[PDB]
Design a protein around this ligand. Structure first.
Ligand SMILES: C[C@]12CC[C@@H]3c4ccc(O)cc4CC[C@H]3[C@@H]1CCC2=O
Lengths: 276, 276
């Protein structure tokens, strides 16, 4: 049949726009299972594939709570072609704030969702692909998994993790014929008493400047889901794909400053200059 | 008054050797609180204490379980001096196997201990260090935080995360007079049924091949913890502390060839060759 594709975080954003893109393909090439934590909020999504003349059943919607591996497992059992050719690990959470401000539950949910959720998926699906000797797996990365961002300490922790996880696997799955690629996004588009009370005067100031500077870079350089979604195809279709794919070239310079000096000294100074 | 040092995971290895090295420094500069998950395992440490002759009072132990933020606050409370000049986030866990063989609680145990653990510590101790405008935090890093290694997927994920968490904080922490540095360690000194069934046959061979090479490399490469602890010392004293310190040159060129190929596929082969 088609190349089967299962994707996570299809509610809003990237996962949504990529789900529709592959379903609607001029080839009719890819059967898509989009997955959602609330199956109800698939309103957003079904319009923009009815909208695009997505052929007889090119888009299926399953419920997948990445925090829970029974839910991951039901989802595999209810993929009735009994393979996956393309796995997209996209669900993710952000956590912005001063570290000592952040709720412990919030900290663990970001890890559980960003990192462990992705481990569940690869646990559930990855054996089948190795059994076979082909399969592709695509993980929504972040430039914040590649370099550290003030006040995104955990989010970044969480995306560095994915790199770690994916790079280690990649090394093992070289001779197996299974392929693994990270898609590294810059930004993309879709308390003050409390903050002060849970930190100090100096951090509070730095948080709000970071925010201004952040809102700024968002407006000069935030990409849109469908662009990002293109880089996924570019890597699906790739004959022999690479471990990474960058969506913009805009942070190659800051990155090269980090790769220049492993002591980390140049990068810390730079990025602090950049931000404040 | 002495420099107040608080160190997690002093049961053994690096943190045991670091706590005693500091307690017995001829300067008698250091007041060390050596923490352990379980107080019953503090024997080797005390053998080691009077053995290097740490003076009376240079060393006390505390129970501290980095999984539990109440255990973190109880400990912080036992710092009689009411301040911490040097924090050493060293507690750590390993996890070695095919990803799909690893169990769910284990996978999470590691993140919770290696990553969240370090967050709780930093959450409970950075506030005072920022108020004072002084403080050093040292974090036990790994080769596996810098480059992925087959069959250490979750281990490396948890160590990539510290790189992330640490770098992001360091970008914020530079105007505050609080220094955070990572001590990047290579290897350091001090069922098969189950594994076959939870994975495929070719993986199985690759695992005991890895293991063979991994024991192979622990004989040609493993440093004394004495050597490693001296690197922590150097970082502590350094007037201009950099974000990373490496205890060895060995793996630096794998790190370089990793760094100048952002695509990542050179590193991937390089490491596969190295290993199999
Ligand atoms: C830190 C940053 C603002 C916030 C950006 C940000 C925030 C969230 C995210 O998922 C990705 C990115 C891309 C890089 C970040 C910028 C680099 C230069 C700058 O000032």
């Amino acid at each position: 049949a088609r190349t089967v594709v299962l994707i996570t975080g299809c509610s809003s954003g990237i996962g949504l726009h990529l789900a529709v893109r592959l379903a609607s393909d001029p080839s009719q090439s890819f059967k898509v299972y989009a997955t959602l934590r609330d199956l109800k909020t698939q309103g957003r999504l079904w319009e923009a594939a009815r909208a695009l003349a997505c052929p007889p059943g090119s888009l299926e919607t399953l419920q997948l709570d990445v925090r829970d591996s029974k839910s991951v497992a039901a989802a595999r059992e209810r993929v009735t072609e009994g393979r996956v050719d393309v796995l997209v690990c996209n669900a993710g959470l952000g956590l912005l704030g001063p570290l000592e401000a952040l709720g412990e539950d919030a900290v663990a949910s970001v890890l559980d969702v960003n990192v462990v959720g992705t481990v569940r998926m690869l646990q559930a699906f990855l054996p089948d692909m190795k059994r076979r000797g082909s399969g592709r797996v695509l993980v929504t990365g972040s430039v914040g998994g590649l370099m550290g961002l003030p006040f995104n300490d955990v989010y970044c922790a969480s995306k560095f993790a994915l790199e770690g996880l994916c790079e280690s696997l990649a090394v093992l799955l070289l001779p197996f014929g299974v392929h693994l690629s990270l898609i590294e996004c810059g930004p993309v588009h879709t308390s003050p008493e409390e903050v002060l009370d849970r930190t100090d005067i100096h951090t509070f100031h730095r948080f709000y400047q970071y925010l201004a500077h952040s809102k700024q870079v968002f407006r000069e350089a935030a990409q849109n889901p469908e662009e990002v979604a293109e880089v996924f195809l570019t890597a699906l279709r790739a004959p022999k794909p690479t471990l990474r794919y960058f969506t913009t070239e805009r942070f190659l310079p800051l990155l090269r400053m980090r790769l220049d000096d492993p002591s980390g000294s140049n990068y810390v100074t730079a990025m602090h200059r950049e931000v404040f």
